[PDB]
């Protein structure tokens, strides 16, 4: 990779070989195609899974859901044309994207019909059938999470990633609990580190020790960050990782901070989350030894919009840990209201 | 931090934000032009060290030796302006750069007055004395190894919009055994990892497993690579690292290969070394259980230049491991000749 | 302009000073956001334009239309506060954007600012009223072209945008048929040339002569390209400008190719367009003197998706001219099917 | 290509792809070592030229003269060993270089490469052959302009050079009065224009109209600027070109200014000029209709260093034109002294 950079603290400039890591979270990437292997093979796999009793799918990330939405209609058309009666219906992703115990089997043979749908870009109708292969969506009662598949697709190549911008996939053969390595990038240079993938951008710094600086999450996954793509992965205890290991947080020393423990019960139901170590607007935080213990994260403002003004923490170190979302400004587990009834506090919905 | 990018494998052009890592190994010639912070205080420290029994400084990296060689004149003048009797003699760098029990003291106060040094750094006139604060060189007899100082210099700032960017060093405050963190860059992106600093460039890739691909060594240090700049340092035994831990090799799973132990007795005396996994030119290797055991490495050609074309090893995996040096191609420790007297084989020099 | 680059024909690096022109059409992230300098001045001007008989204004460029979309709410709210009966409603893009006889007159005064208008924008669009300053849209029946403004804006200044350069505008004073020069950029570096603005990119090259090499269009203006920013204007015949002078094509010898002429009946209805000189999969052209005459472009495939493979050209040169739109390949006005019914050909309506 | 930029005019740091044109004259960063692509073939060319009767060659560009002096020894070493009596002597360039009425003969076949001539360079010379093939210099008496070769070479290609690219050359089989178009570069960006090559750097901008701004000439060619690299060719009259078309002034409206005619009697005998528009040090020009006629350029200081302070111009414009050479400032044709004897004035020379 031949490329350049322009420093912002200073203004030095230089171009030359190396390794370049790009922030695709705030950039919002671009339009993509997401060719899930051979649409015929995907149709055969979904039919075979339906035979076994796999009633639906829960997207692991926000690219798989978009791929399913894109190929919905054309998969339905392929199914109708063949001697198969099954409808694929998709929906909206609800965070956090929970786990599933099933995997889509790889078909032994392709369906016996013409393969004119390679790259099918939707734009086709089909007849509705009673039995449906629900994907994501609010079809919880219809298809319980028990019989739902999860993490079955494996990125293969990035053919024509400059202008076409297509990410090709294929159904994986072996069981795994691991996130996709192909879209992960980690880097450290001097006193700045950054772990990231298509939806996570974590930043760490050095101040007498390596610690967490800032994080921007546009989704809440549940896979496991691979160890081969994380820095300093020895002697680390899981009780100190700010982003729990159950939400795809690196198992690393850069993933911690002094005075804080695992944030397992935060506002993980939001759509966009930014972790900033700074006081919530209009509120003050102090360290007192009489403050309460750790519990669910609470929002700064009440239901009617009134702002709370005094907060306390037991052992946290300023500046505090606060989550920023479209709903408002939240606070960490260690930070509790100084004096306020629990009625007006909007606890986060527990994530189990 | 915005930067260029063009990958020739995919011809993809990108422009974004993040962390950009560069290969600064070729530019070892003239990467910098500077002097340590306030060479007046450096002269004070040198004198105080001389009073306490520090007769020499064995450099740890080629950058440090170059700094000493480029500041010799000004430091000598500052010594021969107050009344100090000390001669700084800077020799050549002998690989591998070895260790020093002692450390350079931090002075309490500067010298009484050295303003003449201001504005007079390169073209400075002084005289010679009897006392010799030798810096490396071929002076083991004069100042033995046990009385030298080693790895007592840090970095504060570096890089500028110029061909030679000033680097402001500083005397270390406390004991330490690790290489300089400020000049290390690690990065993994998909199936390509890169560990690197100003003299090392180690490359790894995934082929059904994370392995070692290639390594370029312009020096042979003896510090210890910091773990905070290492990928996947969990559950790794030090007997499998290809580049030993005693020659500042990363303690990671990316720093090994299957069928090869640690290479303690390689050709660590060369000026420039490249580690490659490919058959040594003109020769061939076979996998046989009746070949020789582990020991010092051997050169492909004899003293007169005769090419040895037959080699064997017990349990290695092809392609073999060969060290490429200015002298020539050298084989791995586990690879031995099938039919050749040990008198005709050049044994590598091992320094412990 | 302090900066630098990497030449990828020879793979060389060099940092210095000069003039730098960038390819702003194929940009990963947006850098320019049209805005109005004085929304009060714009609102007064809009009211007066309606009073003298302008029912709407056709956007000249997509980015001006985006600005109109953004301002719609604030303009409606502020007009309603004072009591003005005007209701700005913006339609969707239709290509090309036809020129209008009228010009937005410069307002005599400035519209007053309401107390609640501070910060009220992007969501305060007002109800439809008798006076409706429609903008763009495929609704010319409501607003005839003869009573539509066109190109009444100027680049007052280039505001500083760290992430997105904000460009503020003021109502034009001079009636001109010329594009905005504040965003134009032309260059020749030996044999490579480039004409560009916000939405155009016309590459050119040298092979025994100066000929068109490629292009890219994300809109379809109707301005006239200034000669001050054109290379080799003199001596050109308008009948040979590939991109017609009516659609803002440069008047130069760089805007031409041998064997072709003005393409005025091309796929100018497409939303985006890549003019490329080569055949695309599933076709073939043979230079034959008996082929058909010059007529509107015909897509390679049929309405049912069947591809015509035999093509003939009268006096063309290989490779041919094919426009890559969002639907698929097309072939220039000099390229006709060898043998195919006219019914199965998707002709493109001439834009005039 | 992808490029750096930290422009300090607007402090807008930008990156992207496009065309980058670098200043090379004002910075004197002539980082190109001119060489012949086939220095061996040139011996046959000079021999054939001498057979016809070309007594000498006058350089068209300072870099051609640099090449000639660099290859003087290369040619002289071989010429003695092929039974050829011809010695090339390269002098100094006398600005402004003149237009010669012939070119070198086209080579017939390759001249054999001698064994001992190989490796001989400008450190070894021929021993005073009877006929001397002079290059440049004040040898007009020895060989007049009437038999001088002029502009017979063209840049063949660009060699690879980290710090100094080796420009390659080849003989032209044609008669063209045009400058080397493979080292030219032109560009307009918003309001910023620049016509450039190895030795010229003309600058232009807009203030109510496109007018010349400044220039920097480190030589005085006599080639004609091609119009394929000029902005706004059409409509220009040669009589208005500030820098004469005979001294390689671009044919455009950026090459001209209002209130000035062509300056064909300027200080064209200098060694380097900086044309600029501002009053000479401590002088004053008045606008009076009774001033003198157009005439040579008169320096501000007389032969003894006395300054003239009162100047006039009839159809004048301000700030005035004044070319700054290494001897001092001069005033344009239209600017004449109000009251001063003609004997104390300095008059330039026209190299028709
Ligand atoms: C961070 O480090 C700097 C020096 O690098 C130190 O002065 C500062 O106190 C540290 N902490 C904060 C919160 O800035
Ligand atoms: C892995 O290595 C083997 C042997 O070196 C080679 O044949 C193969 O192409 C490599 N690549 C992969 C993806 O396994």
Author numbering:
A (entry chain C), B (entry chain B), C (entry chain D), D (entry chain E): 1 to 352
Paper quotes:
We expressed and purified full-length recombinant ZIKV NS1 (Uganda strain MR766; Zv sNS1MR766wt) with a carboxy (C)-terminus poly-histidine (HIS)-tag from the supernatant of transfected Expi293 cells. To achieve a higher resolution cryoEM structure of ZIKV rsNS1, we obtained a suitable dataset for single-particle analysis by increasing the sample concentration on graphene grids. We similarly observed asymmetric tetramers and achieved an improved cryoEM map of 2.9 Å, although the distal ends of the β-ladder and wing domains are poorly resolved and there is significant smearing in one of the dimers. While focus refinements on the individual dimers did not improve the overall accuracy of the map, they showed obvious movement between them. We proceeded using the overall tetramer map to model all the residues, including uncertain regions such as the flexible loop at the wing tip, for completeness and interpretation of the protein movement. The range of motion hinges around the β-roll interface with movements up to 15.02° rotation. The dimer-dimer interface consists of the β-rolls oriented almost perpendicularly to each other with potential interactions between Phe163 in the greasy finger of the wing domain and Asp274 of the β-ladder within 3.5 Å at the opposite protomer or other residues resulting in the assymetric tetramers. We observed tetramers of ZIKV rsNS1 (dimer of dimer), similar to the “loose” tetramers reported at 8.3 Å by Shu et al.. We first superimposed our ZIKV NS1 tetramer map with the “loose” tetrameric rsNS1 of DENV2 PVP94/07 clinical strain (EMDB-32842)24 and observed that they largely overlapped. Overall, our tetrameric ZIKV rsNS1 is highly similar to the other reported structures (RMSD:1.93), although our model showed a different angle within the trajectory of the dimer scaffold.
The non-structural protein 1 (NS1) is secreted from the infected cell and is thought to be associated with disease severity besides its proven usefulness for differential diagnoses. NS1 can be found intracellularly, where it is essential for virus replication, docked on lipid rafts of the cell surface membrane, and abundantly secreted into the bloodstream of infected individuals during the febrile phase. NS1 is comprised of three distinct domains, an N-terminal hydrophobic β-roll dimerization domain (residues 1–29) formed by the intertwining of two protomers, an α/β-wing domain (residues 38–151) that extends out from the central β-ladder domain (residues 181–352) giving the dimer a distinct crossed shape. Here, we present high-resolution cryoEM structures of ZIKV recombinant secreted NS1 (rsNS1) and its complexes with three human monoclonal antibodies (AA12, EB9, GB5), as well as evidence for ZIKV infection-derived secreted NS1 (isNS1) binding to High Density Lipoprotein (HDL).
